[PDB]
């Protein structure tokens, strides 16, 4: 009946159409700040001098971009890892030139996304659920921290965190390969395995359940109407799914325990993607992919090339062309 | 920008024709129940 208590009950109420919660109290304002600034910047921000060389890159639609080329451009290399809020600029015109919007957007998003994960724990508690959905989500979250915060920290500049745009994403991943040889890094290989395997097991599981649905409908109606929301009986025959897939491979490589099966679905892409987030996070400190350049030589000592050397010719073309006016000395050390 | 003029009509139809088709089937579905 007390005023603070009634506020607390509304924040944590399981009856709001969207749950708020204490994590929500921080998530909502920060995700709105990040979203609103993002939308305005993508449409209308003027060009940004990302690399600190007075060579501004146009990222917004009204400055001659389309949906595929546009981006909020990372902040200036002149700033490095320095905090650059609006009130540190002599004006919005200066803040826009040097790429202030990027910092605002990423810091608010990373905060709000972190609270999104917390919110997932919180509602799980209010509803009497088990708690670990949020752990699943830590994998994507970790990935976003790596490209927007950890890699900039290791390389000394937000100019090198990932642009917020489609073509800027590709720029970031090409330059990464040139400098880190990510393809030859095992943690990236486990990411591909987690993502390919995830898509595979998604398709497998969806096709196995779908294959073993119990006839509940006629030819003239969606089978989906054979399940009614909240029915207590299962809607497929798992023993039939087991019996088909066990014979497709062999019995003991198929799940007949639906709990094990669904835990397996969860763990494979979560773990794969933890590792790939760890890949970006450790390559941020320049522990790069395997280097087999000139590893094979002949009895005289001629180099005998392999595919690794061909990959290196490609990495070299990326290397020598990226940020083509920004290097004055022969080694690109960060 | 020097952009393909027909891109506009193409985009509008691309959105409009499929969307209108769905709405037609939705509304006549609701009018049944």
């Amino acid at each position: 009946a007390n005023l603070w208590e009634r506020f607390c009950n509304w924040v944590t109420s399981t009856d709001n159409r969207l749950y708020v919660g204490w994590f929500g109290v921080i998530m909502i304002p920060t995700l709105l700040a990040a979203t609103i600034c993002f939308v305005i910047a993508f449409i209308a921000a003027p060009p940004v001098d990302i690399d600190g060389i007075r060579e501004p890159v146009s990222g917004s639609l009204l400055y001659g971009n389309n949906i595929i080329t546009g981006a909020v451009v990372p902040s200036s290399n002149a700033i490095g890892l320095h905090f650059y809020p609006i009130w540190e600029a002599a004006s919005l015109d200066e803040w826009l030139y040097n790429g202030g919007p990027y910092q605002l957007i990423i810091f608010h998003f990373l905060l709000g996304a972190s609270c999104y994960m917390g919110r997932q724990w919180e509602l799980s508690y209010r509803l009497g659920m088990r708690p670990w959905i949020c752990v699943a989500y830590s994998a994507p979250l970790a990935s976003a921290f790596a490209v927007f915060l950890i890699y900039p920290i290791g390389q000394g500049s937000f100019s090198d965190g990932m642009p917020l745009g489609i073509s800027g994403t590709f720029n970031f991943m090409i330059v990464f390969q040139a400098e880190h040889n990510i393809l030859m890094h095992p943690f990236h290989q486990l990411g591909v395995a987690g993502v390919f395997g995830g898509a595979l097991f998604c398709a497998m599981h969806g096709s196995l359940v779908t294959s073993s649905l119990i006839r509940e409908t006629t030819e003239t109606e969606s089978a989906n109407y054979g399940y009614k929301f909240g029915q207590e009986e299962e809607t497929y025959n798992i023993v039939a799914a087991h019996g088909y897939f066990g014979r497709l491979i062999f019995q003991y490589a198929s799940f007949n325990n639906s709990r094990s099966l669904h835990f397996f679905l969860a763990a494979w892409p979560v773990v794969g993607v933890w590792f790939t987030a760890l890949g970006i996070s450790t390559m941020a400190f320049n522990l790069n992919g395997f280097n087999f350049n000139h590893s094979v030589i002949d009895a005289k000592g001629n180099v005998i090339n392999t595919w690794a050397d061909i990959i290196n010719r490609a990495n070299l073309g990326m290397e020598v062309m990226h940020e083509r006016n920004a290097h004055n000395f022969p080694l690109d050390l960060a | 920008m020097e952009v393909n003029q027909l891109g506009l009509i193409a985009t509008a139809l691309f959105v409009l024709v499929p969307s209108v088709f769905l709405i037609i089937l939705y509304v006549q579905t609701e009018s049944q129940q």
């Binding site: 639609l61 389309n66 929301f229 | 920008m1 952009v3 506009l8």
Partner: peptide, 30 residues
């Protein structure tokens, strides 16, 4: 005109979001 088209589509998606959440078929038990 390209700018207006891009933003128009993006605006329709946001509106659609609004209706899919607050004006959904409400799921009903059994």
């Amino acid at each position: 005109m390209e700018t207006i088209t891009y933003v128009f589509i993006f605006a329709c998606i946001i509106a659609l979001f609004f209706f899919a959440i607050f004006f959904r078929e409400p799921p009903r038990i059994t």
